[PDB]
């Protein structure tokens, strides 16, 4: 899409409808006349287009009104109202831009942010952008959180996020123009290589994949058209539904052989009855012939009865010879039918072990996408974010993704090595209680108007708690934390002194021996300038490889490569790194998933802020003080970076609205 309408699409907004967001701030316009709505909608799209067309410089209200034309620029307050709404919610002037108007010397309001993850940073940025006092508390000695980047010498490899899922309407597209990112496309071609070490031949490779994609749809049909969503009280998982489909396909393969062979018996046995007439008729023919012989052996001249006997017997034998010929006619048809059925047999199996093992690799990929055993994904909801997919090639970051958090952290008050242990929030303010990660006796108290919490869902999940909330988080919040899924997926970094793989292939798979080990080193990436191969550990295997030394893991990786490339061309690796994200206590996992019995609604619960009780009974309802952001709070775009970023932009919006006032809604 292009025009002013390309800006709406690139801003994740319908170009010709007001969003629910916008009805909230402009309820005059959306309840008003259709003409007004279109004027508004244009002003919205046009300003977005301006910001988009150049996102390294702030878009001031003046700059906007300048470049609007009548009748669109006839109404200044509509244009002012609209520009501020976009600015507050991070739709324009977000990320890294040169400010025209420098920051107000004195800031109003003070906010603590827990975590300098990408969501943290992005809100910090926006709050400071809005003239607020913003201090971030990071447990790690580095920013970026789950966006981590290994750097040693010329080697560079993300241990954390590494792909940008398409720039169609993706904020990272702005951030990239925004700060140099070496973005390179990811060539879709992935050869598989069985345990033996040889390529799956292309014919099998497409007919397994197609069966995979076909099985997936099958579950979706079980879910939406047969309502197979709850079984024995527990909700059904995707893995369950896949088994019920594979079983019902193995069922059908058998019902199909049975009713085929059962056509053979039903014809073999027509032949049984046909041969019994024919063997009992060759016997009557054997007898009359004897009789007719005996009758024509009474030499003539004879009386007429004795003459009739020869003729009558001759007729009879001719009658029974007609019958026996008509029946070896019929015997020919049935004999031909049996060769037909015994030569077009239906299929022997549903899938063989070679096919099923390959399919298991396609399941390993899906456990990779969702960072969890398919047995835990919600059948009804695992793919509810699939409508909001961006458009375009997926990319990698060849200089490392750390470049983006570091970029964002420029100018922000970041206290590194600072483990928050108690969040304490009351009708009159909050105090956050942290320690120093190095000597943990040394204690820190932070007072603030509001706490924005970007603690990983896995951290929020710890029992017993890594962070105490005082007072406790309400049940509606803590139940949402249990229901939600926080999964795991680790990776291994392999640094060699020479390229020994196909350099025109970005990624190539490895097929596992078992279903149980389908995730174990199932996939490798050539992504970087330097000779670095990067190897995934997904599914049930991820959580088990965290209990196994780096050498053992690296040793297994070499063996798989040896198989595919030969022992001669795969030398021992100069530098090796293995991630342990479930182990890491500042993450306790890799990212969220829609667990069975959860829904996208839990993602919205995670984002509702908390408003504490009145200090003095009878005092009026207080302001909200505890806010949440991060990858697990954006229901439409979970378990990503752009989604983390978006949630940070979001809360920064609603927090400013809270303590700074929303002058755009009149």
């Amino acid at each position: 899409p292009s025009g002013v309408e390309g800006a709406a699409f690139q801003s994740r907004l319908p170009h010709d409808r007001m969003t629910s967001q916008e009805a909230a701030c402009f309820p005059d316009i959306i309840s008003g006349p259709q003409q007004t709505q279109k004027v508004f909608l244009f002003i919205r799209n046009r300003t977005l287009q301006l910001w988009l067309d150049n996102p390294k410089i702030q878009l001031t209200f003046e700059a906007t009104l300048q470049q609007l034309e009548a009748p669109y620029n006839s109404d200044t307050v509509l244009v002012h109202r609209v520009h501020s709404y976009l600015e507050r919610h991070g739709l324009i002037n977000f990320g890294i831009y040169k400010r025209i108007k420098p920051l107000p010397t004195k800031k109003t309001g003070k906010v603590i942010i827990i975590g300098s993850g990408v969501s943290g940073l992005a809100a910090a940025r926006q709050l400071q952008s809005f003239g607020m006092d913003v201090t971030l508390l990071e447990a790690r000695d580095r920013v970026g959180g789950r966006v981590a980047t290994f750097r040693k010498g010329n080697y560079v490899a993300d241990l954390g996020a590494m792909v940008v899922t398409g720039l169609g309407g993706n904020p990272m597209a702005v951030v990239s123009k925004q700060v140099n990112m070496e973005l390179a496309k990811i060539k879709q071609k992935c050869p598989l290589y069985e345990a033996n070490g040889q390529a799956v031949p292309k014919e099998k490779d497409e007919m397994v994949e197609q069966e995979f994609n076909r099985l997936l749809e099958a579950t979706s049909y079980l879910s939406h058209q047969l309502d197979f969503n709850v079984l024995n009280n527990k909700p059904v998982s995707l893995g369950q539904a896949l088994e019920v489909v594979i079983q019902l396909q193995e069922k059908h393969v058998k019902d199909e052989q049975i009713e085929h062979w059962k056509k053979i018996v039903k014809t073999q046995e027509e032949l049984k009855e046909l041969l019994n007439k024919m063997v009992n008729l060759k016997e009557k023919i054997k007898e009359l012939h004897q009789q007719y012989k005996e009758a024509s052996e009474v030499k003539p001249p004879r009386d007429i009865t004795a003459e009739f006997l020869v003729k009558s017997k001759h007729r009879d034998l001719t009658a029974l010879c007609k019958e026996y010929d008509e029946l070896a006619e019929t015997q020919g048809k049935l004999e031909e039918k049996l060769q037909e059925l015994e030569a077009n047999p239906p299929s022997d199996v549903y899938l063989s072990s070679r096919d099923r093992q390959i399919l298991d690799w396609h399941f390993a990929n899906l456990e990779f996408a969702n960072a969890t055993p398919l047995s835990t994904l919600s059948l009804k909801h695992w793919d509810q974010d699939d409508d909001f997919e961006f458009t375009g090639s997926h990319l990698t970051v060849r200089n490392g993704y750390s470049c983006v958090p570091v970029a964002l952290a420029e100018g922000l008050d970041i206290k590194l090595n600072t483990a928050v242990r108690q969040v304490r929030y009351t009708a009159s303010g909050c105090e956050v209680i942290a320690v120093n990660t190095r000597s943990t006796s040394q204690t820190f108290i932070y007072k603030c108007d509001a706490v924005l919490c970007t603690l990983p869902l896995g951290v929020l999940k710890q029992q017993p708690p890594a962070v105490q909330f005082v007072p406790p988080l309400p049940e509606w919040k803590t139940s949402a934390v249990q229901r939600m899924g926080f999964g795991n997926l680790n990776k291994v970094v392999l640094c060699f002194d020479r390229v020994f793989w196909d350099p025109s292939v970005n990624l190539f798979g490895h097929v596992g021996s078992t279903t149980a080990s389908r995730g174990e080193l199932f996939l490798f990436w050539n992504l970087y300038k330097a000779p670095i191969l990067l190897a995934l550990v997904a599914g049930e295997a991820a959580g088990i490889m965290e209990n196994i030394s780096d050498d053992v893991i690296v040793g297994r990786c070499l063996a798989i490569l040896k198989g595919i490339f030969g022992s001669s061309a795969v030398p021992q690796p100069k530098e090796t790194v293995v991630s342990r994200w479930r182990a890491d206590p500042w993450a306790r996992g890799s990212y969220s998933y829609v667990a069975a019995g959860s829904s996208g609604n839990d993602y919205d619960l995670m984002a509702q802020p908390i408003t504490p009780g009145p200090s003095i009974p009878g005092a009026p309802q207080p302001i909200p003080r505890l806010f949440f952001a991060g990858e697990h709070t954006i229901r439409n775009y979970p378990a990503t970076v752009h989604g983390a970023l978006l949630s940070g932009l979001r809360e920064a919006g609603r927090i400013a609205d809270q303590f700074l006032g929303a002058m755009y809604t009149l």
Binding site: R214, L215, E217, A218, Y221, L222, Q225, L226, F228, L231, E243, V244, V245, Q247, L248, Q249, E250, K251, H252, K254, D255, Q257, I258, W261, K262, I264, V265, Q268, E269, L271, K272, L275, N276, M278, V279, K282, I285, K286, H289, Y292, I304, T305, E307, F308, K311, S312, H314, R315, L317, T318, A319, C321, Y324, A328
Partner: protein
């Protein structure tokens, strides 16, 4: 509205593979038995029909009789008249047989016969005794 093409998913079938833990293995095992059950039942009729097939060795080639190609005449030699009455007695009203016995009388010379010589040959009696057997 409908499954992917080829994927078989009856609603009825579904319940039957979920009704307990091992029900899915249990239903498949029966079918593996229903399959062996039919499969040797085949070799057993395949065996029985190979026996009945050998008893028909040689067909009926020795028992066949060459063809009387004889031109279908009009007059009724007393010989042919007498073959007729005896054929009526042993063949009822099946003229094709009576025509094939007499050998040179069309099936319609036979019917006419049935009325022309009706009273002289007591066909009513002859026919009613064909009815006796």
């Amino acid at each position: 509205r409908k499954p992917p093409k080829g994927m078989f998913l009856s609603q009825e079938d579904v319940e039957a593979v979920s009704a307990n833990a091992t029900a899915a293995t249990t239903v498949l095992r029966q079918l593996d038995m229903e399959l062996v059950s039919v499969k040797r039942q085949i070799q057993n009729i395949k065996q029985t029909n190979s026996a009945l097939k050998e008893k028909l060795d040689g067909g009926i080639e020795p028992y066949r009789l060459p063809e009387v190609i004889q031109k279908c005449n009009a007059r009724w030699t007393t010989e042919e008249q007498l073959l007729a009455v005896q054929a009526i007695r042993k063949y009822g009203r099946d003229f094709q047989a009576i025509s094939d016995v007499i050998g040179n009388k069309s099936v319609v010379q036979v019917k006419n016969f049935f009325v022309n010589y009706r009273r002289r040959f007591n066909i009513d009696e002859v026919l009613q005794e064909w009815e006796a057997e």
